[PDB]
Design a protein around this motif. Sequence first.
Motif, PDB file in Angstrom:
ATOM      1  N   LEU A  30      47.420  30.144  42.009  1.00 14.55           N
ATOM      2  CA  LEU A  30      46.390  29.308  42.589  1.00 14.55           C
ATOM      3  C   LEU A  30      45.942  30.076  43.826  1.00 14.55           C
ATOM      4  O   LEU A  30      46.312  29.772  44.950  1.00 14.55           O
ATOM      5  CB  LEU A  30      47.055  27.967  42.898  1.00 14.55           C
ATOM      6  CG  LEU A  30      46.183  26.728  42.938  1.00 14.55           C
ATOM      7  CD1 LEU A  30      47.056  25.492  43.155  1.00 14.55           C
ATOM      8  CD2 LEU A  30      45.214  26.896  44.082  1.00 14.55           C
ATOM      9  N   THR A  31      45.132  31.092  43.576  1.00 16.23           N
ATOM     10  CA  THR A  31      44.684  32.040  44.591  1.00 16.23           C
ATOM     11  C   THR A  31      43.361  31.853  45.291  1.00 16.23           C
ATOM     12  O   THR A  31      43.113  32.521  46.291  1.00 16.23           O
ATOM     13  CB  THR A  31      44.644  33.426  43.981  1.00 16.23           C
ATOM     14  OG1 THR A  31      43.639  33.453  42.951  1.00 16.23           O
ATOM     15  CG2 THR A  31      45.997  33.757  43.364  1.00 16.23           C
ATOM     16  N   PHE A  32      42.502  30.977  44.771  1.00 20.36           N
ATOM     17  CA  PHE A  32      41.193  30.761  45.385  1.00 20.36           C
ATOM     18  C   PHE A  32      40.296  32.016  45.334  1.00 20.36           C
ATOM     19  O   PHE A  32      39.364  32.170  46.124  1.00 20.36           O
ATOM     20  CB  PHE A  32      41.369  30.339  46.833  1.00 20.36           C
ATOM     21  CG  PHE A  32      40.121  29.786  47.468  1.00 20.36           C
ATOM     22  CD1 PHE A  32      39.512  28.635  46.958  1.00 20.36           C
ATOM     23  CD2 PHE A  32      39.601  30.362  48.623  1.00 20.36           C
ATOM     24  CE1 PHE A  32      38.407  28.072  47.601  1.00 20.36           C
ATOM     25  CE2 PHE A  32      38.480  29.790  49.271  1.00 20.36           C
ATOM     26  CZ  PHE A  32      37.894  28.646  48.752  1.00 20.36           C
ATOM     27  N   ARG A  33      40.581  32.923  44.414  1.00 18.06           N
ATOM     28  CA  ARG A  33      39.773  34.136  44.295  1.00 18.06           C
ATOM     29  C   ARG A  33      39.911  34.644  42.881  1.00 18.06           C
ATOM     30  O   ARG A  33      40.728  34.136  42.119  1.00 18.06           O
ATOM     31  CB  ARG A  33      40.271  35.204  45.281  1.00 18.06           C
ATOM     32  CG  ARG A  33      41.774  35.445  45.165  1.00 18.06           C
ATOM     33  CD  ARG A  33      42.215  36.564  46.108  1.00 18.06           C
ATOM     34  NE  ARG A  33      41.839  37.860  45.565  1.00 18.06           N
ATOM     35  CZ  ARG A  33      41.860  39.006  46.246  1.00 18.06           C
ATOM     36  NH1 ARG A  33      42.242  39.025  47.523  1.00 18.06           N
ATOM     37  NH2 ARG A  33      41.500  40.135  45.640  1.00 18.06           N
ATOM     38  N   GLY A  34      39.094  35.625  42.513  1.00 19.34           N
ATOM     39  CA  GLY A  34      39.190  36.192  41.177  1.00 19.34           C
ATOM     40  C   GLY A  34      38.223  35.648  40.150  1.00 19.34           C
ATOM     41  O   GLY A  34      38.157  34.440  39.904  1.00 19.34           O
ATOM     42  N   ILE A  35      37.488  36.560  39.523  1.00 18.31           N
ATOM     43  CA  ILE A  35      36.501  36.187  38.541  1.00 18.31           C
ATOM     44  C   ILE A  35      36.924  36.582  37.136  1.00 18.31           C
ATOM     45  O   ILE A  35      36.873  37.754  36.772  1.00 18.31           O
ATOM     46  CB  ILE A  35      35.150  36.848  38.832  1.00 18.31           C
ATOM     47  CG1 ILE A  35      34.707  36.534  40.271  1.00 18.31           C
ATOM     48  CG2 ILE A  35      34.122  36.331  37.857  1.00 18.31           C
ATOM     49  CD1 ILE A  35      33.372  37.195  40.653  1.00 18.31           C
ATOM     50  N   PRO A  36      37.367  35.601  36.330  1.00 12.36           N
ATOM     51  CA  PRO A  36      37.768  35.953  34.973  1.00 12.36           C
ATOM     52  C   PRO A  36      36.505  36.293  34.206  1.00 12.36           C
ATOM     53  O   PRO A  36      35.386  35.948  34.624  1.00 12.36           O
ATOM     54  CB  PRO A  36      38.397  34.666  34.430  1.00 12.36           C
ATOM     55  CG  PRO A  36      38.799  33.898  35.689  1.00 12.36           C
ATOM     56  CD  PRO A  36      37.642  34.179  36.617  1.00 12.36           C
ATOM     57  N   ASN A  37      36.687  36.955  33.078  1.00 16.11           N
ATOM     58  CA  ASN A  37      35.554  37.308  32.245  1.00 16.11           C
ATOM     59  C   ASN A  37      34.934  36.083  31.642  1.00 16.11           C
ATOM     60  O   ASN A  37      33.726  36.033  31.393  1.00 16.11           O
ATOM     61  CB  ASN A  37      36.006  38.176  31.075  1.00 16.11           C
ATOM     62  CG  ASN A  37      36.053  39.624  31.422  1.00 16.11           C
ATOM     63  OD1 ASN A  37      35.197  40.116  32.160  1.00 16.11           O
ATOM     64  ND2 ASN A  37      37.043  40.336  30.879  1.00 16.11           N
ATOM     65  N   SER A  38      35.771  35.080  31.406  1.00 18.40           N
ATOM     66  CA  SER A  38      35.315  33.915  30.683  1.00 18.40           C
ATOM     67  C   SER A  38      35.735  32.588  31.254  1.00 18.40           C
ATOM     68  O   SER A  38      36.453  32.506  32.268  1.00 18.40           O
ATOM     69  CB  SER A  38      35.878  33.981  29.262  1.00 18.40           C
ATOM     70  OG  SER A  38      37.301  33.892  29.313  1.00 18.40           O
ATOM     71  N   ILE A  39      35.292  31.552  30.551  1.00 18.31           N
ATOM     72  CA  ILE A  39      35.639  30.171  30.863  1.00 18.31           C
ATOM     73  C   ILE A  39      36.969  30.031  30.123  1.00 18.31           C
ATOM     74  O   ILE A  39      37.018  29.605  28.972  1.00 18.31           O
ATOM     75  CB  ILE A  39      34.586  29.214  30.282  1.00 18.31           C
ATOM     76  CG1 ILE A  39      33.251  29.474  30.986  1.00 18.31           C
ATOM     77  CG2 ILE A  39      35.045  27.746  30.469  1.00 18.31           C
ATOM     78  CD1 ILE A  39      31.996  29.034  30.177  1.00 18.31           C
ATOM     79  N   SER A  40      38.047  30.400  30.814  1.00 21.84           N
ATOM     80  CA  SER A  40      39.388  30.415  30.234  1.00 21.84           C
ATOM     81  C   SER A  40      40.326  29.271  30.615  1.00 21.84           C
ATOM     82  O   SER A  40      41.466  29.220  30.145  1.00 21.84           O
ATOM     83  CB  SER A  40      40.051  31.729  30.607  1.00 21.84           C
ATOM     84  OG  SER A  40      40.223  31.802  32.010  1.00 21.84           O
ATOM     85  N   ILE A  41      39.854  28.382  31.485  1.00 18.33           N
ATOM     86  CA  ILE A  41      40.647  27.246  31.936  1.00 18.33           C
ATOM     87  C   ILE A  41      39.674  26.221  32.524  1.00 18.33           C
ATOM     88  O   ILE A  41      40.076  25.055  32.731  1.00 18.33           O
ATOM     89  CB  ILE A  41      41.685  27.706  33.013  1.00 18.33           C
ATOM     90  CG1 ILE A  41      42.682  26.569  33.308  1.00 18.33           C
ATOM     91  CG2 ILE A  41      40.945  28.211  34.259  1.00 18.33           C
ATOM     92  CD1 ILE A  41      43.323  26.024  32.031  1.00 18.33           C
TER      93      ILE A  41
END
Length: 820
Positions: free
Chosen positions: A809-820
């Motif tokens: 639960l980092t409040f940062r980071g852009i995943p490639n997709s709608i994964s959660i």
Amino acid sequence: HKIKGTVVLMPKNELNLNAFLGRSVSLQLISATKADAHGKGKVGKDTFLEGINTSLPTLGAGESAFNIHFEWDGSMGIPGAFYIKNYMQVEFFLKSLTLEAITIRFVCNSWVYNTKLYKSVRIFFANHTYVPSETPAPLVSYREEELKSLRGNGTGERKEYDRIYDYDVYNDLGNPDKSEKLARPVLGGSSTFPYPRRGRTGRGPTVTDPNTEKQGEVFYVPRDENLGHLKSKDALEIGTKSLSQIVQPAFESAFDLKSTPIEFHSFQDVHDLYEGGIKLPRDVISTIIPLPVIKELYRTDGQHILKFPQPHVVQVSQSAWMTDEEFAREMIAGVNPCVIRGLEEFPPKSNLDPAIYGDQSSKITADSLDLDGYTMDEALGSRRLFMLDYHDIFMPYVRQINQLNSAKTYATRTILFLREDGTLKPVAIELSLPHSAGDLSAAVSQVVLPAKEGVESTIWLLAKAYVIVNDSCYHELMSHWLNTHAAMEPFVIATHRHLSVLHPIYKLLTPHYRNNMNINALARQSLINANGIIETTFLPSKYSVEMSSAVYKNWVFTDQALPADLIKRGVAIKDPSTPHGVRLLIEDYPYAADGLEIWAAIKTWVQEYVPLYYARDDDVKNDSELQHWWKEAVEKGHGDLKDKPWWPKLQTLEDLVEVCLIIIWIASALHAAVNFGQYPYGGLIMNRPTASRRLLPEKGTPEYEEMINNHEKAYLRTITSKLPTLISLSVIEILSTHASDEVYLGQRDNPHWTSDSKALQAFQKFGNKLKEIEEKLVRRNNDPSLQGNRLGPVQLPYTLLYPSSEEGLTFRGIPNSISI
Ligand SMILES: [Fe+3]
């Protein structure tokens, strides 16, 4: 005369070896250059796994390598694909096949079930990329047949091992067979309730309603959409099901048994949740503590204590959320930073029918606003007036929501002034209620102005609460659920149904679909279902999802592009002289400023990729798969809006770039920006209340006196109750967590996704650019002049659009997709 190959796979128990040998698994190579009498690539002999290879260290993730040799004379041409049949009873996860000295790579990453379960043999292609007109002639028929297979025939109950992608409406949320009260309108397929389509499951009609799909223990998704995980803690998507089905009931019993106070009585009772924790019945802790994912949500003494993690928003100041500064700042750097709009006239206007809701004129007077010495005309002209406008959005639903027991809301509007120091300040909140002859309620609309002392300060605080309840509802159902999860699924379906795994656009887009259908299916089952998590924790209750359908009426694909969105909302203007082609009207608007950087990086990537496969516009118009893909995506996937004029035509390189750029933006950065701040900002229920249970009290009532004497209690009685709060906090904690096996923007799950070094080089630059961008955002967060909006009084650096992140639960980071 023999081709040495290496097969990498994962036995089911990972997401012994020797059992894979013998005649358990056979593979047949298929020629891409030598064809039979029908033009189809020649197929080799069934070749079984020979033995366990234990040579290269580079082989983790519970993976195992298998040696195999194929009888392939140069006369059979060059292998471009292969069939595989699993004779074992249990399915295994095929990672890849590598053919040496001829190197040919195949990226499979697919579950292979027992051969008897398949109508046709599983086929896999080499990692080469081909638009349809470039497909080697011997593989052409295999290419179209695999697509035909993926499309299925639109009928039948889908099974766990099916890889059939098709569409269906949202008619699987209600549970009429259990109770008429759980009946829900079908969303999609009508003018009343237009809605993106979702993945077809085919369970069949309920007993009481032929238009509603019956319940199912497992909501199907094409097999490979259901991501397995090496670490159970990473199966975050299953958390919602456990929460709704196991934890929620356990929480309720503790309340039914009166083992814990039913309501929070002070703000400290809420802060207690992440400090000393909450004491619950032993059998309640025992029910939660062993569940995967759920157990990662709380620290426990193993006996009676559950402790939530301290939300980022209170990590420096537990009281900062209450400041007007933070209230306004979160509208541009919070969990839902994309609803605020410029206000160019005053008073604000409504397009709703006064005959139905009563006179809709705003009651906010210009002279009552503190615009730091500016006159209304000056504020308007200098583009310093903004608003968070939920008046027209919520008004149509206020009456029905308020008829509910324990739900009372206002259709709110908040006026904001952009101060000379660059921060936004809230200057008025209008709390509107519908009015019609015969109304039983005496409650009336009202305007509340900022106040720091007395009961006025409490009324203003409650006004902010009503606004954020509107905002949390809109954020969860529209900004988040509709605009990312729901809007994206149609494109996932279409991509698999019409773009071959060989297609360059398939390779460009699919990484941005990872786990989307999976989380969506689990959502339809436990999150947005009748009496599901959202309905039981958010204000609209049984009206929640249909509200998103009403909003979808105005969803515009092309307005999802970031520049277009900013321009449409009046927070930026087109400006050719600027790097991004747009000039922000709030210069230090964290979400938009950081967003434009990511948006530009994705654009450069798409613009550099497309040219590698499409030389001219004609090459786009003439790509049969691409045309069928887009045509279906629009006319079927988002079919309820197929009549809209704004849909791109996809006859030009420009259009292709645009469509792919928007799809990637929505799936990655847009979703990250509205998703990963949920617990960081909403983990303190007072900061992001999900529901309001009563309207403002009339002077001369015990409720009014309470506002004066116990403002915290007045606030807590107004917002989400303690039980639903425990449930909602748990779900947003899950949703704000990054699985350790996530694949972020600038990353791929396999370095060999394509053999084209050109595409690979472009991707590497894209990744370096993202790293470059992150350094820049770090510099922005460290810039003292930008502290007001990027950090605020909560001193929480805006890192939601930082491209990279470690797990958690980092409040940062852009995943490639709608994964959660
Ligand atoms: Fe999400």
